[PDB]
Design a binder for this molecule. Structure first.
Ligand SMILES: COC(=O)[C@H](Cc1ccc(CCc2cccc3c(C(=O)C(=O)O)c[nH]c23)cc1)NC(=O)C[C@H]1CCCN(C(=N)N)C1
Length: 123
């Protein structure tokens, strides 16, 4: 249907934005890179369903913060939040469970990229 296709395009969009941020990291210089890798992100214990996207939404602020230091990020992140809101909706009440171990921005982006590919595959 067109409802599922709309969802699929939204996920492809979110995945692409995440991948673009990740690719940007390849160009950051050394002093800069080292500092940024010590900024920690919180990871979802389980992220296999759209509702789990709240675990990404709550981490968008810290994401914006680090992206501003390493440089518009305000616009990009806002756009990602819009996609996330569209995908999980605001009707479902789910509370995010985070793992104990925090992670670098690289692992954080990789995990959400995998999440996006995982949902896309089930469609
Ligand atoms: C207790 O706090 C900590 O140990 C660290 C501290 C910290 C570590 C690193 C940084 C920054 C970053 C940075 C990024 C990009 C470029 C640069 C930079 C340069 O450009 C340069 O001068 O070369 C200097 N510093 C930079 C800012 C804060 N902060 C974090 O780990 C951030 C999390 C803290 C809790 C809430 N957070 C969350 N994910 N929910 C974020």
């Amino acid at each position: 249907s067109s409802s599922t296709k709309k969802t699929q395009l939204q996920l492809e969009h979110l995945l692409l934005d995440l991948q673009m941020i990740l690719n940007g990291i390849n160009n950051y210089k050394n002093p800069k890179l080292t500092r940024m890798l010590t900024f920690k992100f919180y990871m979802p214990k389980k992220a296999t369903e759209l509702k789990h996207l709240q675990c990404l939404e709550e981490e968008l602020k810290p994401l914006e913060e680090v992206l501003n230091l390493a440089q518009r990020p305000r616009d990009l992140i806002s756009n990602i939040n819009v996609i996330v809101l569209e995908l999980k909706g605001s009707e479902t009440t789910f509370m995010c469970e985070y793992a104990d171990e925090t992670a670098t921005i690289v692992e954080f982006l990789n995990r959400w990229i995998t999440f996006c590919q995982s949902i896309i595959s089930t469609l």
